[PDB]
């Protein structure tokens, strides 16, 4: 409605998902996701291996935003940390 025409400086043409295991400082694996998706199922990740990840959003204006993230880092391997020994109420 009302045209809604505006050069919004936030239009992604493609998302590049780059991941590489911490045991490798070599090449990153690259997967390109269409610039209208918000999730990707990465196949080829080793279980129990720390990975480096980079989400590069290529915007139509040639604007590149690289969001660096990590995987296999949130290891909730709590060895039964019982601190509860006081009954409330």
């Amino acid at each position: 409605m009302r045209g809604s025409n505006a050069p919004q400086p936030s239009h992604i043409s493609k998302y590049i998902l780059r991941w590489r295991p911490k045991n490798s400082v070599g090449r990153w694996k690259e997967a390109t996701i269409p610039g209208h998706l918000n999730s990707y199922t990465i196949k080829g990740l080793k279980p129990g291996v720390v990975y480096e990840g980079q989400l590069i959003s290529i915007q139509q204006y040639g604007h590149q935003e690289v969001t660096r993230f990590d995987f296999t880092t949130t290891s909730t391997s709590t060895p039964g940390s019982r601190s509860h020994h006081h009954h409330h109420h």
């Binding site: 400086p9 999730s39 990707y40 990465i42 279980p47 935003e65 969001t67």
Partner: peptide, 30 residues
């Protein structure tokens, strides 16, 4: 350098549903 002072940078992607060799990585685009 940090040229992008505008908030058109995707927030930290969330990794859910971890399989043996696959994940679901979800990101929020501006």
């Amino acid at each position: 350098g940090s040229q992008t002072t505008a908030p058109d940078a995707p927030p930290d992607p969330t990794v859910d549903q971890v399989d043996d060799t696959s994940i679901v990585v979800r990101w929020s685009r501006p």
